[model samples]
Target: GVQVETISPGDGRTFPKRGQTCVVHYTGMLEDGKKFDSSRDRNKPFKFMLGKQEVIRGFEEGVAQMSVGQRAKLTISPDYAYGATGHPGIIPPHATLVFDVELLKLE
Candidate 1:
């Protein structure tokens, strides 16, 4: 479970579906505000499939609740992310991550 604080709510509750393709631009950070990664920095939005579990659970879960053009900060629990053995060099074990995500489009 996680907390999603909306920055700019998108059009309506038109959420994406399972196996749907979605696009988003996001900035992932540590709890203390250390920027870990961001799609904006790459100058391109990130695209992926929903419900395929290819990305972290929090990401899919958070984005799943969003509509196209939606912007929100998702507070992701550790278990939903890296878990016990966190990603090396960036995320630590049991760390709560924060992300600024914008659902650019979905289909």
Candidate 2:
């Protein structure tokens, strides 16, 4: 992929590498904006490595355009999020996940 905007990988307006870990805040929702998960309520940010499956692909890709203290709303397709074999009731087969994310920190 070509270089896009430098929005900080959590501090510098650039996306993090595949193995680099980052701290961020996020909200998950359905296509209709039905809230599923939100770090805003917890008043804290979440952290994870870029390539780790701790989150879906749509979420990780969203933060790639964020900087420290920057927030973004991201939409992902089922292919990138859960694929055709989703989790249990939380996610159906071929379900997509949306994330409103804030890049907080990187390590």
User: How well is each residue in 37-105 modelled by candidate 2, as lDDT tens digits?
Assistant: 888898987888877777776666776656666766677788877788886777777765667777776
**Deviation in Å, model 1, residue 51 alpha carbon:** 1.9
TM-score per candidate, chains pooled: 0.94, 0.76
Evaluated against the true structure, the overall lDDT of model 2 is: 0.69
Off by over 4 Å in 1: none
Q: What residue pairs are clashing in model 1? A: none
The candidate that wins on lDDT is 1
lDDT of each: 0.91, 0.69
lDDT of candidate 1?
0.91
Best by TM-score: 1
TM-score for candidate 2, please give it.
0.76
Model 1 lDDT tens row, 1-57: 678999999997789988999999999998876898999997899999976778889
Q: Count the backbone clashes (under 3 Å) in each candidate.
A: 0, 7
Clashing pairs in 2: 6-13, 7-13, 7-66, 8-12, 8-13, 8-14, 9-14
